[PDB]
């Protein structure tokens, strides 16, 4: 039950990311390929919603680990009650990503190595222990620990025939969160939208633009992935990646274009804690 720690030689990708899971959309299409997820318990993956069809979710994708080629099988797929991304058409929103988050219950039980590994989700005692805090630790304090009111070092992780890139984002929490959730009108379909706050809801957090530093953009593939905080040689995952402004898979023109406003947004798990807590209530992660 030790999560979020590397399991040891100097290696690569897997053995440095071992919770990271790649999933591949079984009939692709144009935006819907791949996505990434984490493993969260010795049954559970955590991605996106949007990564699946919305019927037969559980025959719509596969996923593998630890770099694996072999696919684990997908026994029920539970998407966060909320989300619908046809939510908000009548507002002019062909996508609505709000509450874009999903467990992923597989068969059979995962066997934890060098390579397989689950990362700490907040509001867990797993997460105490990892930050080294004390037996008193609220969630209002672990959430005043990970995620202050300022510019927020981070990062996650993008996947490419088994390699992963590990990539330094900076979330904007402090007085760059207005600015950075603005941004959100540049995204190609958003750009009508008379209140940006309908697009961009309490569920979100914000990475990306040049300021305080450039931080890499999302693609589509990066989907589902972790967003993570690294403190002292633990990674605790505090978002899932949602959706971005640009996608630099493809059209690089338009970053150089826009660099100041390229955000990407993720949902914040501090957010959905009643949902996380109650479906995984029997995986031995300690929730608060
Ligand atoms: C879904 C999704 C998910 C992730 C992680 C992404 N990362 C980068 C883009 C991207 C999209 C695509 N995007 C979603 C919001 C509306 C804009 C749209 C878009 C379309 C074409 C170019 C740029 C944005």
Redesign the pocket.
């Known amino acids: 039950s030790l999560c979020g720690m590397v399991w040891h030689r100097k290696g690569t990708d897997y053995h440095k990311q071992p919770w990271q899971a790649k999933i591949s959309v079984i009939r692709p299409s144009k935006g819907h390929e791949s996505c990434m997820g984490a493993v969260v318990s010795e049954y559970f993956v955590l991605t996106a919603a ?1 990564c699946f069809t919305v019927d037969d979710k559980e025959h719509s994708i596969k996923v593998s680990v630890g770099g694996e080629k072999r696919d684990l099988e997908i026994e029920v797929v539970l998407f966060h009650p909320n989300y619908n991304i046809n939510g908000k058409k009548e507002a002019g929103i062909p ?1 609505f990503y709000d509450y874009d988050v999903a467990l992923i219950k597989l068969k059979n039980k995962l066997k934890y190595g060098q390579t397989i590994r689950p990362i700490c989700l907040p509001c867990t005692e797993g997460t105490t222990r990892a930050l080294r805090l004390p037996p008193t630790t609220t969630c209002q304090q672990q959430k005043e620990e990970l995620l202050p009111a300022q510019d927020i070092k981070a990062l996650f992780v993008s996947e490419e025939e088994k390699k992963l890139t590990r990539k330094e984002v900076y979330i904007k929490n402090g007085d760059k969160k207005g600015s950075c959730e603005r941004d959100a009108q540049y ?4 750009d009508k939208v008379k209140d940006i706050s309908e697009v961009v809801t309490p569920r979100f957090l914000c990475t990306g633009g040049v300021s305080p530093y450039a931080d890499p ?4 593939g ?2 589902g992935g972790p967003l993570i905080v690294h403190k002292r040689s633990r990674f605790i995952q505090v978002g899932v ?7 630099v898979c493809k ?1 690089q023109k338009r970053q150089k274009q826009v660099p100041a406003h390229a955000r ?1 947004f993720h949902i914040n798990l501090f957010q959905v804690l009643p949902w996380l807590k109650e479906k995984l209530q029997d995986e031995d992660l300690g929730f608060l």
Do not use: F, K, Q
């Open positions: 949007h996508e995204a190609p379909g958003y953009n999302t693609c589509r990066d989907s990646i949602s959706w971005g402004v640009v996608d059209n990407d």
